[PDB]
Design a protein around this nucleic acid. Structure first.
Lengths: 129, 141, 73, 149, 61
RNA sequence: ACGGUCGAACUUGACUAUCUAGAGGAAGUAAAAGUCGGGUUUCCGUAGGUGAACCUGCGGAAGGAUCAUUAACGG
RNA sequence: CAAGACGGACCAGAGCGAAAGCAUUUGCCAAGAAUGUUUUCAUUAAUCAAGAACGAAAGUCGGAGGUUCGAAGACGAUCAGAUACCGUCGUAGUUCCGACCAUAAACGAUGCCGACCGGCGAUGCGGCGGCGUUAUUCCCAUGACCCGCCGGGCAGCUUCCGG
RNA sequence: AAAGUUGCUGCAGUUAAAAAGCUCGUAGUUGGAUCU
RNA sequence: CGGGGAAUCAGGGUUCGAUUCCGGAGAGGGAGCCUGAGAAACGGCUACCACAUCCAAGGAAGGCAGCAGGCGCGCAAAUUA
């Protein structure tokens, strides 16, 4: 069955970005997906999107800018401490200049850099570059 | 594929040890049937008594007679065949002689032309075969 | 709740395995003394126990309070 | 896909976005509720009541008109059956298959389909025991099943 | 039994002939199993002897 | 000294496990140039044929090299 | 005239079934997919150690029956050395009923559930929209065709998607 | 350590070693939106 | 024997840890004691089991897994200062 809707959304975004498309339809929607796309938007990676608000779980159509190489989820959502965030960013990210571990902390869903700034740890969600 | 849940630790480690038993070197090291079939009994070297001298015929593409020796080890009574390396070095060996033997290099596997020899003679009558061959020392009897 | 004036409770937890970075589910059973002041205790409800001196061969804790099951009214 | 079949079909309903009662529907919630009460007194499961209300009386959805769904109205007034509708239908189907297998012994497919029906019955019984709809001591037994229906 | 089965034979002849055939097959399979066991035992002892010749008593002197 | 307690150990049979002498049997090996001398494409499972191989029966595979024809049919 | 067997051609890259498999008429019996639904329940789900039903052919026990075929077996041919091939006969078996067995190249030599990434039109079932031909112009719906569209199927062709 | 030839990171399972004949099913594992 | 720890290692890991520090256990094997604040103590006692010393043949005395040293064992390890 459908488990982990964030994985489906990120895979659909990756597959249609690799194909050269301009817009992606991802269904279902969730708060986690919207937060991930908001973080990924603030770094100028994806563009802007609409949440089609049907009375079910919504849909999202997201515009695509050709700036994305790989957006991905980490399943399971491992616990990450600040002492162990360096190993994760060494494992997943192509370079020290760019790429993003997204993680959920009690201060919200953010990047690894904002997690270092706010001195928080949490559970890993993804990475994009 | 593989299980990747946050609660799959015992499944992963149990499957790891079960498939670890399918590794040949792991099963040689840990089952304990190769260690009791090994004549040295987990020793680098063993010391035995020369029973007889043997000409072992080399395997098919090479034509030679390799000078080996049937030795009985002192500590367990097992019988092995040990190769005497250099030329004329079998003449330094007599029957019923005290001989230090080591493995030959491939960890219990036969080496090169010689069929079924895992061992080589290191010392004869408590003097090395190297010093006898190079003529540095003399052998008692 | 089958032997006289003492009961068997189960404590569940996750034990961490560092190689795989995962957890496994583990449990331990404890025989704990149940006083007759806690009557109409059923199976599957939460109990808070406190450590005391040994009372028998296996009993080391004593029931302090009883909170009913999640579904039981 | 299906629970016990290889099929993966898409046959299902599609409710509209519009939750409001249509302006042509001149029926209050009380009239629909008394209609549900008299259909239950005639004797019908909530699926049948919903179908009759949809086909003839123009009631598109009961819970858009009254605010409540049919089985909750029946339970609130007190005409709900003791066992649920789907569990009742599954047990009835199992009883019919058992009768056929009593008549015909060599029918292996009837045995296989009976095993599937019992699996579905046990799944539903476990689910209803978790939700305190059935008593915890409830059980499906081979011999006394036609007495339940 | 190597006999043709004609049409005039009835019960208590056909069933006796069938039972004789079934007995023949039964001790035939017993003898087959015994032969399998004997050949297996002989193969194991001769492989033991061949490996003994590989280990020792094989050389010139 | 009676009694009790803790209890080493001793004897008798069974279950055994290990160490250590053996008449004999069946073998192999080194020594005797001593005596006599055509079929198959490739398989699988089961059964029979003297054990296996192999052949046949039954049921399965290809992991075996598709040329030529095919628009009317209404009165 | 009787006996047992088998349901050809129609029969297809068609259909059904969890797989093994399934083809003469009619009736009875309980099942089932798909489609259609502005029906109901509301997470009841997926994959599954243990455990459990089914499982070609061959084979084994009891009974029945033995048309054809037919392992074994008996003959006849065939040759420096033929003892497999070939032909005639033929036992177990091949058929049915009730018990066992649980194996196949039991194959797509390809786990199941879920998502996304090119295209095209044939077919099977269901549904929808239709100008027309036909049931000797049919009096109205309905069946057979014709043109599309949707959903689940058995498959196919095409492609420098990527491997 | 080389061994990503024990693979959690991180291996394989058409033809090279390898997916159970098939389905059900308990423990185990995993489990769709939704509440500032 | 267990830890502190050690070798190797990108990251994850694999393997070692009899061995001087902390804890436990035992003085050939078992068992039972006396004294004492503290031992079921062994450079204390009493037995049995296995070894083994001096005998005038009645008796007596033993316990190096302390330090050196010896035999044996072994591929394998030091001075009776």
């Amino acid at each position: 069955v459908r488990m982990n809707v964030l994985a489906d959304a990120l895979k659909s975004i990756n597959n249609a970005e690799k194909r050269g498309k301009r817009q992606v339809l991802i269904r279902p929607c969730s708060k986690v997906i919207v937060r991930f796309l908001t973080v990924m938007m603030k770094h100028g990676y994806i563009g802007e999107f609409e949440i089609i608000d049907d009375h079910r779980a919504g849909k999202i159509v997201v515009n695509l800018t050709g700036r994305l190489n790989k957006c991905g989820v980490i399943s399971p959502r491992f616990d990450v401490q600040l002492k162990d965030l360096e190993k994760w960013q060494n494992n997943l990210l192509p370079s020290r200049q760019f790429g993003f571990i997204v993680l959920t902390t009690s201060a919200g869903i953010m990047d690894h850099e904002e997690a270092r700034r706010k001195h928080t740890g949490g559970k890993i969600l993804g990475f994009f570059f | 594929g593989k299980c990747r849940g946050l609660r799959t630790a015992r499944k992963l480690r149990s499957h790891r040890r079960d498939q670890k038993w399918h590794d040949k070197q792991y099963k040689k090291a840990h089952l304990g049937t190769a260690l009791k079939a090994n004549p040295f009994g987990g020793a680098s070297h063993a010391k035995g008594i020369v029973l007889e001298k043997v000409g072992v015929e080399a395997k098919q593409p090479n034509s030679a007679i390799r000078k080996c020796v049937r030795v009985q080890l002192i500590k367990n009574g097992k019988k092995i065949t040990a190769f005497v390396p250099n030329d004329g070095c079998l003449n330094f060996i007599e029957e019923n002689d005290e001989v230090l033997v080591a493995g030959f290099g491939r960890k219990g596997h036969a080496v090169g032309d010689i069929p079924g020899v895992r061992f080589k003679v290191v010392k004869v009558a408590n003097v090395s075969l190297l010093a006898l061959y190079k003529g540095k020392k003399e052998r008692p009897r | 709740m089958k032997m006289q004036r003492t009961i068997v409770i189960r404590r569940d937890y996750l034990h961490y395995i560092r190689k795989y970075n995962r957890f496994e589910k583990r449990h331990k059973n404890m025989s704990v003394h149940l006083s007759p002041c806690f009557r109409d205790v059923q199976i599957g409800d939460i109990v808070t126990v406190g450590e005391c001196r040994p009372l028998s061969k296996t009993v080391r804790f004593n029931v302090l309070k009883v909170t009913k099951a999640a579904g039981t009214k | 896909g299906r629970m016990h079949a290889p099929g993966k079909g898409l046959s299902q309903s599609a409710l509209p976005y519009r939750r409001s009662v249509p302006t042509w529907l001149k029926l209050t919630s009380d009239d629909v509720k008394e209609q549900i009460y008299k259909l239950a007194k005639k004797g019908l499961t909530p699926s049948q009541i919903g179908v009759i209300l949809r086909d003839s009386h123009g009631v598109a959805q009961v819970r858009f008109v009254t605010g409540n769904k049919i089985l909750r109205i029946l339970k609130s007034k007190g005409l709900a059956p003791d066992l649920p509708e789907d569990l009742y239908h599954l047990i009835k189907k199992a009883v019919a298959v058992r009768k056929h297998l009593e008549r015909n012994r060599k029918d292996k497919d009837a045995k296989f389909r009976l095993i599937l029906i019992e699996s579905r019955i046990h799944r539903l019984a476990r689910y209803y025991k978790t939700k305190r709809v059935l008593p915890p001591n409830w059980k499906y037994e081979s011999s006394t099943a036609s007495a339940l229906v | 039994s190597t006999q043709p089965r004609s049409k005039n034979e009835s019960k208590e002849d056909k069933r006796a002939r069938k039972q004789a055939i079934k007995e023949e097959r039964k001790e035939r399979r017993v003898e087959k199993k015994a032969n399998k066991l004997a050949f297996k035992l002989e193969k194991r002892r001769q492989e033991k002897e061949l490996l003994n010749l590989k280990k020792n008593v094989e050389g010139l002197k």
